[PDB]
Design a protein around this ligand. Structure first.
Ligand SMILES: *[C@@H]1O[C@H](CO)[C@@H](O[C@@H]2O[C@H](CO)[C@@H](O[C@@H]3O[C@H](CO)[C@@H](O)[C@H](O)[C@@H]3O)[C@H](O)[C@H]2NC(C)=O)[C@H](O)[C@H]1NC(C)=O
Ligand SMILES: *[C@@H]1O[C@H](CO)[C@@H](O)[C@H](O)[C@H]1NC(C)=O
Lengths: 272, 175, 175, 175
């Protein structure tokens, strides 16, 4: 991910690359200075759980679950940009989400559904916006008392915006909370809102593996294979013990604090 | 040493013998030189090879990712994770250190035992036809040519064939 | 073998001796047969029994339920649980495998040592009253009846009682 | 005993010898008395001292408060805490009991071994210059004054110096 962490990559932070082709990976590498993530301040719900679920995938295809040009005829899908997420000096937003605002002076009740016909699990992410002031609520959504509802065959949660002035983070006194769910094949996910909903635009069809992990390291990536990986580097050995790094991924020797494990095979050496 | 041969009544090793771990030096009218007892060496090399492979190959691990990530309100489970990683680290480190210490001692005793048995096999073959002159050396009371030397190394030394000549020479020497 | 007796200078075992682990074959004017040295056998059987019980009974576990259940938003602690079960599995498997490997070797060396000490106890008793004819056998220079045979097995062989007769027969035989 | 000396062919201990664990009684024309072999005693005292310190000092604990407090709606974790305290209690009690049982047996065998080696060191020194009269006692075939006695205890007994006189006296005694 380089410049970005998993949050920025999976949301579409403007400073992050995007995967167009269907891809797969055996594990995930962040650098210790990967500090991009959620450029609009807030909480990413169950972030650590999502990172574990994404550590390794057999298949991964991004698709436009709610196409931008046709899904929101009665709402404005172009003004939802912010200076908290700049792109080339101009206001922007996450690539995978659309910050819907009122069209003119009307924000009608929103109702959009998707049925998973991809044959695999679909990762859907969305955000809830909590403005700083009642003025800010009405300037964006026109309605004062709003709710968001997201429902699936297994997920059901109702969101209520919480309006108050928070200390400025990236020049934002409001906050935005980020949510995710996995939609099983053949299931429907329903979105309903009278405001404050940061809708999905791109979702991810994926197949999870047996979980790998995440390595946070500055070590470069090369075209070597290996069967045991550490943040310092890869390990090619049949020996049962190693002292390079306790945190490893793969079929690895046990980690020990030993500096030397020399096993005698020959005789006591007594020349002359 | 546990068996008394290596660094014991055989004081030192032979840099001149290069083809084996345990062997012979011989000297007769046809010349002298070093030779290695192939059977005892190959048996010991097979044994030690099996020992090293046993220590290595009995460790069969599966695919695993040790790392775990916890947020700032998950300190207790983070510490629980640390205790697991630390406890496994302590168990493996201590066991690995002692296994090498103990088995290295067993390995050197093994070589010591192999040398003693080799010396004793010859001594039980020659009996009074040769004298035990120390340092693992036998001085014959009868001439032992290259063929006779190989019979001793092959465990086929014919004691009655030379017993009379050795007896006469032994009594003359002792007189 | 580490001590040279089993599969060594005593080449093979006796299917004919069925009542013990280590024993004797004898032959005198009264007949022949196999007998087992009860003291050395019972001591070894007590020793090995204690060894097996030590390996088994030192494992004393309590009541425990290994299983744990986690929901779909608890993958990290689920994997932490798996790491604990896997780490214990790796530690116990490797330790169990090496314990059996190492202690099996010690057990066979133990039997080898017990045989060597039994042979040496007799040899130190008979001294020159008998000849060491190989394969763990002693050929007497004096007649040794059933009572005399039992004295050797009982560790009460009276060397001076027969020393003169053996000396005369030994010198006559060697002459 | 495992080595046969203590409570074996040396039937009892000496209250008269008070300065050491293993030693000598002597009697010559200059008198008699008890003396202790300082080297073997100090080596054994160093060995046992190291054994006791090893058992004690390898236990290095940190600061810890065992107690825990739970309210009436925390019975499950209270019982989990009890299982931890009980399991540690069972492990330490059983291990402590067996460690003392097993190492006490090793300690008495150690003393038995030290006595046997001391007896054998003397026997291998005197050879036929003295008679083995049982109970760990040697009766000399030549006069052995205080200086000669100290040489035996010092491991510097000059066998050839007295061999001729002992041989003449031995043959006269046996005749
Ligand atoms: C992606 O990551 C980089 C950092 O790796 C972000 O750039 C950082 O943006 C913050 C914005 O708050 C800068 O801090 C602010 O700087 C100004 C001027 O110095 C000051 O008034 C503020 O109090 C605060 O310190 C920070 O300097 C800047 N870092 C760098 C290295 O340029 C970037 O915004 C991220 N972009 C996205 C879209 O996530
Ligand atoms: C790694 O293994 C894969 C699969 O066999 C192969 O395509 C690739 O060339 C290998 N890479 C190296 C560097 O050996």
């Amino acid at each position: 991910l380089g410049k970005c962490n998993i949050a920025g990559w999976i949301l579409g932070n403007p400073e992050c690359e995007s995967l167009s082709t269907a891809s797969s990976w055996s594990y995930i590498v962040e650098t210790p200075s990967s500090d991009n993530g959620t450029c609009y301040p807030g909480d990413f719900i169950d972030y650590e759980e999502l990172r574990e679920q994404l550590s390794s995938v057999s298949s991964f295809e991004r698709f436009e679950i709610f196409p931008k040009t046709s899904s929101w005829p009665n709402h404005d899908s172009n003004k939802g940009v912010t200076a908290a997420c700049p792109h080339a000096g101009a206001k922007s937003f996450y690539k995978n989400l659309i910050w819907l605002v009122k069209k003119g002076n009307s924000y009608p009740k929103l109702s959009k559904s998707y049925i998973n016909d991809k044959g695999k699990e679909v990762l859907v992410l969305w955000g809830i916006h909590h403005p700083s002031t009642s003025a800010d609520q009405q300037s964006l959504y026109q309605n004062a008392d709003t709710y968001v509802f997201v429902g699936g065959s297994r997920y059901s949660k109702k969101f209520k915006p919480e309006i108050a002035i928070r200390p400025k983070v990236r020049d934002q006194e409001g906050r935005m909370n980020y949510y995710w769910t996995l939609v099983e094949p053949g299931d429907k996910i329903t979105f309903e809102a009278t405001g404050n909903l940061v809708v999905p635009r791109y979702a991810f069809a994926m197949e999870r593996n047996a979980g790998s992990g995440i390595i946070i390291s500055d070590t470069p990536v090369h075209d070597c294979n290996t069967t045991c990986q550490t943040p310092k580097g890869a390990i090619n050995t049949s020996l049962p013990f190693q002292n390079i790094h306790p945190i490893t991924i793969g079929k690895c020797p046990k980690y020990v604090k030993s500096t030397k494990l020399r096993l005698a095979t020959g005789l006591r050496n007594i020349p002359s | 040493g546990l068996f008394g041969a290596i660094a014991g009544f055989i004081e030192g090793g032979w840099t001149g013998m290069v083809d084996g771990w345990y062997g012979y030096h011989h000297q007769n009218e046809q010349g002298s030189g070093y030779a290695a007892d192939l059977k005892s060496t190959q048996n010991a090399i097979d044994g030690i090879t099996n020992k090293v492979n046993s220590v290595i190959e009995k460790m069969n691990t599966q695919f695993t990712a040790v790392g775990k990530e916890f947020n700032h309100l998950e300190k207790r489970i983070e510490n629980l994770n640390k205790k697991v990683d630390d406890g496994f680290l302590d168990i493996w480190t201590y066991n690995a250190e002692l296994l090498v210490l103990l088995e290295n001692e067993r390995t050197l005793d093994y070589h010591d035992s192999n040398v003693k048995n080799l010396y004793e096999k010859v001594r039980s073959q020659l009996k009074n036809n040769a004298k035990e002159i120390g340092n693992g050396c036998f001085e014959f009371y009868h001439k032992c040519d290259n063929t006779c030397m190989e019979s001793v190394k092959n465990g086929t030394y014919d004691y009655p064939k030379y017993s009379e000549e050795a007896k006469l020479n032994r009594e003359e020497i002792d007189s």
